Amino acid sequence: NVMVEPHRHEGVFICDALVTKNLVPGESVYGEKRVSISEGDDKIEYRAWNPFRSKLAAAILGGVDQIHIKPGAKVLYLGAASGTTVSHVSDIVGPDGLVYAVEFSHRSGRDLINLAKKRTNIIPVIEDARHPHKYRMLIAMVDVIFADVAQPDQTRIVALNAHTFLRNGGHFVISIKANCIDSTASAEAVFASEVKKMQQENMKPQEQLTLEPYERDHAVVVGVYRPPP
Numbered sequence: 754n755v756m757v758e759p760h761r762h763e764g765v766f767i768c769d770a771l772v773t774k775n776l777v778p779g780e781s782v783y784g785e786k787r788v789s790i791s792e793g794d795d796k797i798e799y800r801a802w803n804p805f806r807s808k809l810a811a812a813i814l815g816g817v818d819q820i821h822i823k824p825g826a827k828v829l830y831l832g833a834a835s836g837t838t839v840s841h842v843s844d845i846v847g848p849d850g851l852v853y854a855v856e857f858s859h860r861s862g863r864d865l866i867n868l869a870k871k872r873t874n875i876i877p878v879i880e881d882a883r884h885p886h887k888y889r890m891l892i893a894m895v896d897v898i899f900a901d902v903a904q905p906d907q908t909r910i911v912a913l914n915a916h917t918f919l920r921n922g923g924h925f926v927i928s929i930k931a932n933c934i935d936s937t938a939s940a941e942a943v944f945a946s947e948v949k950k951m952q953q954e955n956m957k958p959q960e961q962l963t964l965e966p967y968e969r970d971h972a973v974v975v976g977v978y979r980p981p982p
């Protein structure tokens with residue numbers, strides 16, 4: 754009997770509870786349940802991934818086609834907060850991947866620094882994502898940008914970071930809380946407006962979904978970056 758199965762997304766697993774392979778066996782990050790499966794001399798531990806805390810987990814359970822975050826990927830994570838979702842991104846990309854965790858809160862930044870002490874593949878970047886010139890010398894070209902900055906101007910922020918750091922043909926995954934962009938607009942109006950702006954920066958959406966029942970009026974947009982020569 755096989756208890757934990759590879760999910761369709763590489764690096765993600767099931768048992769429906771979503772889990773990731775714990776990069777730091779023995780440690781929880783935010784109180785999450787851990788499941789360790791021993792067989793002979795083999796041993797593997799997984800970490801439960803809460804979709805009521807993590808928009809990426811909510812999107813995966815909601816049936817997103819691609820997340821692009823995968824083993825070996827280099828990920829620029831804008832709005833890393835205290836590292837809840839970042840820790841699972843770190844699990845997914847694994848030892849040969851990289852996660853830049855950009856977060857401008859010094860309080861949350863201390864959580865990220867503690868998280869990255871154990872996880873060699875996390876680089877904490879305690880900076881304002883509006884001013885990538887301040888940290889551009891730290892960030893190697895990445896495969897994916899994940900953005901959860903929850904600002905009216907977050908599309909322009911993500912675009913600015915994409916133009917600096919994202920490889921041609923790399924991908925983006927953007928979390929959009931509608932009332933953080935414009936609380937006097939309908940969710941549909943916000944999402945249409947942000948998708949339109951993305952297209953104008955050669956950030957081409959390939960799918961979009963909302964996150965019910967985990968969140969209200971919250972979208973994830975996944976797409977591909979195809980900038981001009």
Ligand SMILES: Nc1cc(C(F)(F)F)ncn1
Binds near residue numbers: 833855880882
């Ligand atoms: N949580 C955040 C937000 C930002 C922002 F707003 F400046 F883009 N930069 C970094 N972390």
